[PDB]
Design a protein around this ligand. Structure first.
Ligand SMILES: Nc1ncnc2c1ncn2[C@@H]1O[C@H](CSCC[C@H](N)C(=O)O)[C@@H](O)[C@H]1O
Ligand SMILES: N[C@H]1CCc2ccccc2[C@H]1O
Length: 258
């Protein structure tokens, strides 16, 4: 795995999953609106709050934190690759060539229904993101020892990471335990991932994925000592099946550490 990700191309990844058609948020039945809606509805309950939040395996994306940013003042973004942390930086600093997340910011504002302009939303996200750290979910201590990230975190967010970096279920379970050590007791985990997928492309890189089911995800969460508050499934429509992968569905889980 670690070897495969060496050819991971952030620009090709973003283009494959966050540019039209999947990146076309106008159709409410798409995977993007669905993910944003799951994240928005969860935070809207007001039951997921605190001071610090860690995003596990952020890669070069920020959509997963658009609704979250208004509930946590200290946000930590992370990733295995330096190239991704660099791409993130370009957007956080508003540097040349940053990826345009404005459509997602606008829809998150639309979905949240607080009449917030998307520039304010992006402003808050850039402000509350205090650091982009390297990470390895396979190490018992993902962030290492003595990381600037406040621990234990109040909340964790991770999208398309674990299943995309573990050769099989077992590795998936350990990686889950590994990041859970970063979550404060009683804390919350918002996990999004691919269902029954086995590979996806990112430029020259061809990544293996462990095909997981909703039950396998639920059981793994429980085994890690979580209380599954909510677990949803989104079936990938034919129109969003483009050749960049073989994903069948997408899952969203809101688990609380007990
Ligand atoms: N061992 C590891 N530990 C943590 N993250 C890893 C990893 N190996 C690879 N990754 C990272 O996991 C990411 C999977 S892509 C997910 C990107 C983004 N979170 C989204 O929702 O689209 C990549 O950025 C990859 O570099
Ligand atoms: N590995 C992940 C990459 C991001 C993504 C987005 C939407 C649907 C599926 C997927 C999976 O391929």
């Amino acid at each position: 795995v670690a070897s495969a990700y060496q050819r991971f191309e952030p620009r090709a990844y973003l283009r494959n999953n966050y540019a039209p058609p999947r990146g076309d948020l106008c159709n409410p039945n798409g995977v993007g609106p669905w993910k944003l809606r799951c994240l928005a509805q969860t935070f809207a309950t007001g039951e997921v709050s605190g001071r610090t939040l860690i995003d596990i395996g952020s890669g070069p994306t920020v959509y997963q934190l658009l609704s979250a940013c208004s509930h946590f003042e200290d946000i930590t973004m992370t990733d295995f690759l330096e190239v991704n942390r660099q791409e993130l930086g370009r957007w956080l600093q508003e540097e040349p060539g940053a990826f345009n997340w404005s459509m997602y910011s606008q829809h998150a504002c639309l979905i949240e229904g607080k009449g917030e302009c998307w520039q304010d939303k992006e402003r808050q996200l850039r402000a509350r993101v205090k650091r982009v750290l390297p990470i390895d979910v396979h190490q018992p201590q993902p962030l290492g020892a003595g990381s600037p990230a406040p621990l234990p975190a109040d909340a964790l967010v991770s999208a398309f990471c674990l299943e995309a970096v573990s050769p099989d279920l077992a590795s998936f379970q350990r990686a889950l335990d590994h990041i859970t050590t970063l979550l404060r007791p009683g804390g919350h985990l918002l996990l999004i991932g691919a269902l029954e997928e086995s590979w996806y492309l990112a430029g020259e890189a061809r990544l293996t994925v462990v095909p997981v089911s909703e039950e396998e995800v639920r059981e793994a969460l429980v085994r890690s000592g979580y209380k599954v508050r909510d677990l949803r499934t989104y079936i990938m429509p034919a129109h969003l099946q483009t050749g960049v992968d073989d994903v069948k569905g997408v899952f969203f889980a809101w688990a609380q550490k007990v």
